[PDB]
Amino acid sequence: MDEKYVNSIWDLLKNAIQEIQRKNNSGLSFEELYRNAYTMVLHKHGEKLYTGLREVVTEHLINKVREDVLNSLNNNFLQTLNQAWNDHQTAMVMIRDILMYMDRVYVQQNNVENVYNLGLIIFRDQVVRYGCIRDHLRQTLLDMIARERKGEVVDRGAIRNACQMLMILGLEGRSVYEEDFEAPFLEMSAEFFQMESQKFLAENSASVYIKKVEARINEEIERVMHCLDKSTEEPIVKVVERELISKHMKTIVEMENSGLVHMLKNGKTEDLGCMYKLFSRVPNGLKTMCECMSSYLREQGKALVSEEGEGKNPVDYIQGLLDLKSRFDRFLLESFNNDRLFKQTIAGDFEYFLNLNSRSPEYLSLFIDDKLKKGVKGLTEQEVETILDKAMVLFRFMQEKDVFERYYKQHLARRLLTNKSVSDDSEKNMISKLKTECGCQFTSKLEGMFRDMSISNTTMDEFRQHLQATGVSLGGVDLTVRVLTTGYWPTQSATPKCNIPPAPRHAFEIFRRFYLAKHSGRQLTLQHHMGSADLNATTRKHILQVSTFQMTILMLFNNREKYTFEEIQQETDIPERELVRALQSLACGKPTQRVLTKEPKSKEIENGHIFTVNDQFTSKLHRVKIQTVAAKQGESDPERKETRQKVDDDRKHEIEAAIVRIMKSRKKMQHNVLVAEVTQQLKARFLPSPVVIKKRIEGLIEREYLARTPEDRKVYT
Amino acid sequence: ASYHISNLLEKMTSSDKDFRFMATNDLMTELQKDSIKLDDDSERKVVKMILKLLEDKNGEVQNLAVKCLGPLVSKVKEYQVETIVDTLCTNMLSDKEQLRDISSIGLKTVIGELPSALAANVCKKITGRLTSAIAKQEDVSVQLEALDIMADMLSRQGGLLVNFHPSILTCLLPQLTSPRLAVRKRTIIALGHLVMSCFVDLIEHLLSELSKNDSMSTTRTYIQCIAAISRQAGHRIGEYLEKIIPLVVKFCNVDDDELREYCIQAFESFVRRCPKEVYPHVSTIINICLKYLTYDMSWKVRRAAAKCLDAVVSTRHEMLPEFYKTVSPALISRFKEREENVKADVFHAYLSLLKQTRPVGETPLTMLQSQVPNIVKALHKQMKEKSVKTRQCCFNMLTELVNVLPGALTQHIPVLVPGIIFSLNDKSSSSNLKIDALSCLYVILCNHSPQVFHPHVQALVPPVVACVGDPFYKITSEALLVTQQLVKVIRPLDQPSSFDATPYIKDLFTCTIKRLKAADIDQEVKERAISCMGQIICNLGDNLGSDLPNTLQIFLERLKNEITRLTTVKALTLIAGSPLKIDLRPVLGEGVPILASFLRKNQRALKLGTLSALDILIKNYSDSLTAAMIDAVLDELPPLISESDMHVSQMAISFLTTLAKVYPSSLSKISGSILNELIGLVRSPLLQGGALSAMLDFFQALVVTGTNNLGYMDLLRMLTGPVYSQSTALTHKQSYYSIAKCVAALTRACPKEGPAVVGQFIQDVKNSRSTDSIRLLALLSLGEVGHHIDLSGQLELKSVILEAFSSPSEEVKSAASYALGSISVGNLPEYLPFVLQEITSQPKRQYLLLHSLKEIISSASVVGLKPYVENIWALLLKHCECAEEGTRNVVAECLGKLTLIDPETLLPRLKGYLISGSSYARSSVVTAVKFTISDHPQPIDPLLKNCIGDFLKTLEDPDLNVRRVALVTFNSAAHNKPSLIRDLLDTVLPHLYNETKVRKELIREVEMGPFKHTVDDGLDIRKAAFECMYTLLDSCLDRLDIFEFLNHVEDGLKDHYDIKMLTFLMLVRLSTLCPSAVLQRLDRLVEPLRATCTTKVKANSVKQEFEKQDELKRSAMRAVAALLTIPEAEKSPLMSEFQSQISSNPELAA
Amino acid sequence: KRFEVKKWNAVALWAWDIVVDNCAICRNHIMDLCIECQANQASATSEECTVAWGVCNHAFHFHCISRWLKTRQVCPLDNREWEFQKYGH
Ligand SMILES: [Zn+2]
Ligand SMILES: [Zn+2]
Ligand SMILES: [Zn+2]
């Protein structure tokens, strides 16, 4: 229509929106303004209406808000800014309904921003991005945040509302809100972080530092949520992480006092878990933690695996190692929540420091033998089972299993056959646990040793029944002579043959003849240095005990007294120096329970010394044993080296047993490949030992090496 | 390849053991990668050969065949797995000794290599065969293996087999009465492995079963069975435990040797539960069991009883006093001995009780000192015993005893010193007994006072010399520590001493030199010996002979190591600054260069140690310094001092300070290099407290002494110049403050003042081309120097001050206010009337000099203020005008700071003005008492406590304007000091809840009649009230009333947006703090947030309001997640419907 | 007599048809080397030729049984496969 009608419409619409924004629009109608918009938009004159919208909004902002916020910059600055935001939004809602009714067609045709977005942008450009309000708002926000971090209370809800306001003002997301504001904000944050951490490292301890820095971390997160907005996480977390924990990583765990080593010494358990909880969050914190763990463990091992000076008891030494292992397992369980890295590093350290001694399998075997026979300490089966499991766990992180099982077999030879020194049920449990702890090139020989016991007592009862049916003579009254095989049973010495009880001689001859008629082909014999017997003494009739070399000297005393070394060496066909160990068990180094006394009281052995018997009978019963046998657990030097060389030739022969097959089956060598495979086959048994295999793979070329020999080079050798 | 499989089959058949072994190894390797060529047909023969290899011959082939079965099971199909499972089952169920155990080992690898749907039908068949295998028929070995693999299947497969669980129940329950004693234990393990597997009905069933079964049946293994099943149940068996408790105490009543087992039940049942009445019952039973020694197999009973005592104490910390008093002295002290083990774990129980009397009416210290006497008699009596474990345990008890009580056995030192001498001698028993004895001696020596020690130390020396001479190095190190403590005990270099020590110094010095000059022992003993000899020299060097130079050169020689460096540096710090001065000229001459070299090791501890050693040498000795080594160290510092380490920087600065008053040439060397470096350092914004004071001293001393062309004139131009050329602030904020304080310290160093003050005057008044940075610097330094050096006349103070005050930059105005505030203190009679007159004169200077007056009161003296303070408070009361609320705030701060000094007389007038003042007056007084709150304890606590309590209880129900003010004050008080509110909390609740709810009188439904705006005018108080509720649960929770709190966080959930979010956070925290106290109203709180997560918005709105509502909904969903974070105790209200819109919220929130 | 022996807990060792007089392969002896070694000297190196014991308890010289292991490994005195269990008497 005419320009007068449209200009009057625009004038009254401007008056109406001014009344809307002036908080005095009670006396106003909405239908009339919606009609104004319809008749203004049907005429295709939206450009002038949008320009007038922009002009009136910006002139309002500059006149009212820019004056009000600047006038009260020091009194309720955030409060008047919040009020201006609320008033602007509550005018913008109705401005939005009207100019959005027109902005439908406007944005479907002119591809411009909507009225609400236009108001947001113009407010950002005119107030929040103002040349003076920016700096004052930044300064007051930073000062209030810093004074809140100091410990004082500020209006955290005001900061919440301001952050939400900047969120809605961004209109895209994290654009304006970040950029400039975030930079000095995070700069002030990192400055504060360093100033607090440098203060906090200068106390003395780390036990209180780690608690206090965890409290600081928690309070940062509390402010992040309540005081600030919803996000503000990733940059704040990253900067506080890098500025506290990454900076303190090198020095907070190596302090002389309240350091990681010290808190591992006394046994602090909350501190270790809390330090894990903090340093598992920082990059490469677990790495330095496990490095310090390994350093401490290696230091402790070198303190314990020291070879200069050997006086440690076997059971005690291994029990200490077991305690350390279980304590570190419990530490990892509570503090490190069973972390893989710490388990791997402790396993590696154990493998590294348990093979530094050739005694470790010896001592572990001694400990298992001591705890296996019969233990009054921890009699119930639960503690025995836990100790057994820890012993097997220690056996896991240990190489060179050959000497371990050789000593285990020797322990079976010693304990198994003494009189009744087994529990009759737990040896199968040990065999089963060993079956699932190493490889299986054995175990069937230990169960084969159990087959020998079974046939032994079946033959015992069958021979007793046969003797009852026959009744040859009175020699075999109470005879228990175990049928023993040479193979499974470990080798004893060169059977130092000794005098055999004259009456029981008939019993042993009868038993041997019974077995030479049982299956006939069995070259039998007696192991003189093994076994035991009971001698009846005679005021009460008590029964003594003898261990495989006592009975001969005892009968030599019983038949005739006033004997000496010449008497026991002359008419008895008696063995070598082992006799002196056999004899000293009765007189030399004896407590006040002596069954044999001599007039020449001296430590050394004489020739013409008279032997007598003293009462010394504290045990007024019919069952007294001598405990000189299996007394020392030191495993002295000569037996050490002979068993070491026995193990050496056993290793060397098993190497051949594998080497022959690893030629006979697979294709031949490329001069450097077969040793890797032969070590792969035998890694579970012992160390690779890359020198002996090299030295003897040319040891069988002379005898039984066929096909293309490995060192063919020029021609198949 | 298929050909490879053919070849290995052929070898196995031929029966060649080498070929069989290598074929099996090749089979394992090829199956491990990806089962190369294993078709249905080829699979039918490989499993046949694998089973045959399992059954036939040499054990080497057998284990490799078991290994192949592993990869096979994993890389084979459903039929073949089932087949091999059935075959292993039949092998173990039939005869043939070997087949049984090898098949049992194989079946373990089956359930180990197969975890799921594939293994479900697989394990079903295994369970089916095992159920028939565990029949009641006597097949002892067969059931042994069967229960083994049975508990195995439960242990590794627990997430499945839920259907077969009743079937294994019906065949496992009647297996607990078999005569053979091992299968009963295996069945207990089976039921434990069965109860781990989360099947509820089952456990209730078997519990009712054993309940009905308690009918006089002769069986103890079933008692230990229920013991172990309770052990494995963990934290769900509280009610069933309450059920069995009468049964177990009744079964323990009858005299039997298995009191050990029933006490195992009792202690386990109690150790894994946190009750409120079960401990008495358990304690009663084991006190009986510990008294149970009559005359054997009765030791295990007492062992169990002592373990139970340990558990009891370590767990019920809140019940300590009465139980401690009534059981521990009598029982533990009287039975502080038996044979080997019950004695030992009785000591272990007392060790846990010692750690419970450690917070580190009748306080723990009182009952501890009550325990002490009988304890010392008992441990001495134990010392009479010969066993090594006994003495070691007594040593540990003694160590812990003095760790929980400083004085502990002060009167008993004469009693237990002979025991220590005895344990430090022959008859072997060294092991760890020597280590324990030496550690106990060290603790006893260090913790108490030498006053009771010198006699029994003079009676103590020879044995510790013997332990030092002991070949073992651990005992040597412990003895070295003991000698160090003893020498600290014979000397007292701090408190007066009279005890003569010459022969003991002789002997101790002899053993220390013998141990020290080894160079062949471990690092620990080396460090201990070095520290001990350093202490030897430091304490007892005045009676020492001619061995001092030899030992000192030995210290030099041993210093040059990689491990001994830190200990030697510490000993060098200790040897210096000693009452008994030690000639250290050769050391200085050869160590200052080596310490300078030590500086460049990037080792923080080493840096600090060598810095302190150099400082202390230059401090006391200050005699053998020449140019060479001082030049070396002064060249060494500049790399050391840096922004990355302010504490090391502080130590280096302090070394510079002391050296400044020692070497004249060093001052010039420092001038050059250190002045360059510290000029670089000053501009850093982290200069504070420690380092600030240090640098201030550095400049003070450097300027007051002679320096290379460096003083006032020179340095002042080299301080202002940088910032003047900087012009546009290139720093951030703190460089100006640091430079101003440095200039102030420099000015007060030499009082030839008047040039510099006039120059700063010109700079502040020369408006032409003077940067705001220049202005800031000038004003700040001016105020800082006026602080101490009364600027007094010096041209025009007033003019310059007001000129800088009227600045267009707010920072310049703040600097001017701070400068005036600092000026007034020092010349108060002249400058303070100025402040009053101008505050009462101008209305803008009113506010600005009110800030300056706050500064004035904060940084003034404490003696020359009283009449001035009275005038200040008179003006402050008169100047309560409401032009701006900021003026009200600053005047309130000034009133509070005035109250801090002489509160006694001024406070009652403040309360009276509260009572009789106007609304703005009440706001002023309550804000003043708000900021009267400190952050740390002050001697104002009682009066301020009572009076701020009166303030808050009187000013929490006034007008809405004054209401929110008192609310924010109470918020501040609650956050800062919980210890001044106390009873006020109960009186605050009603007043706070009055405004906590919505007020339907202030909405006014106005300013838009037709258009319906709801302006609240009460949201300010509501936000403040809910902020107080946040700080309430944050500081004081134990005595806070919960029910009303939860009702009105519900009403807050019915409130507006900001209160909605605040209540969401409140709910999250409160549900976390007190879970059970939130479960009562979890459903009640669920109603509001459910209505919140259903409210929709019309399409008429704009997408920004949509993001707002999405934020609200996400906060509500986080609140729901927090309410679900309670340990699953409700599973009730509506259970989170899945819809197209809401379901996105938890997806994006997880 | 003053003292009389009542009980014994001895042990009896037994061996299969090893024939201490003559080897089962070389027919020389259970000890004192084999046909492939003859004398004691001439590069014996502490005489690295011991007796081998198996699970069949049959004992031969290590050289004898190792040289026999070329073709047959069936323990000719029996039908067992001749495991290796021991080295030396
Ligand atoms: Zn032969
Ligand atoms: Zn044979
Ligand atoms: Zn030979």
How would you describe this structure to a colleague?
Chain B: Keywords: Acetylation, Cytoplasm, Nucleus, Phosphoprotein, Repeat, Ubl conjugation pathway. Chain B: This is Cullin-associated NEDD8-dissociated protein 1. Chain B: The modification N6-acetyllysine is found at residues 52, 911. The complex is a heterotrimer of chains A (717), B (1150) and C (89). Chain A has helices at residues 3-21, 31-41, 46-71, 77-109, 115-128, 133-150, 156-170, 179-200, 207-225, 234-252, 260-266, 270-279, 286-304, 314-334, 340-354, 360-373, 381-396, 401-416, 426-435, 444-470, 502-518, 550-559, 565-570, 578-584, 637-664, 674-681, 692-696; strands spanning 478-479, 482-485, 523-526, 532-536, 543-546, 597-598, 611-612. Chain A has 717 residues and is mainly alpha-helical. In chain A, the strands form 2 sheets. Chain A has a two-stranded antiparallel ribbon with strand order 4-5. Chain B has one domain: Leucine-rich Repeat Variant. Chain C has 89 residues and is mainly beta. Chain C has one domain (1-87): Herpes Virus-1 (2-Layer Sandwich), CATH 3.30.40.10. Helix content of chain C is 8%, strand content 21%. Chain C is built from 1 helix and 5 strands; from the N terminus they run E-E-E-E-H-E. Chain C has a 3-stranded antiparallel beta sheet. Chain C starts with a strand and ends with a strand. The chains are: A mainly alpha (717), B mainly alpha (1150), C mainly beta (89). Strand 3 of chain A pairs antiparallel with strand 2 (11-15) of chain C. Bound molecules: zinc ion (ZN) (3 copies). One zinc ion binds at residues 54, 56, 58, 75, 77-78, 80, 82 of chain C.
Give the neighbour order of strands across the main sheet of chain A.
4-5
- Structural class computed from helices and strand pairing of chain A: mainly alpha
Distance between the termini of chain A: 116 Å
| CA distance, first residue to last residue of chain C | 40 Å
The CATH homology group name of chain C:
Zinc/RING finger domain, C3HC4 (zinc finger)
The string of secondary-structure elements of chain C, in order, is: EEEEHE
CATH topology of chain C: Herpes Virus-1
CATH architectural group of chain C: 2-Layer Sandwich
Radius of gyration of chain C: 17 Å
Biggest interface, chains and residues, is: A-B, 82 and 75 residues
Query: What structural class do you assign from the helix and strand content of chain C?
Result: mainly beta
Strand tally of chain C is: 5
Strand share of the residues of chain A?
under 5%
Number of helical segments with 4 or more residues of chain C: 1
EC number (chain C): 2.3.2.27, 2.3.2.32
Subcellular location (chain C): Cytoplasm; Nucleus
GO molecular function, one term (chain C): NEDD8 transferase activity
Pathway (chain C): Protein modification; protein ubiquitination; Protein modification; protein neddylation
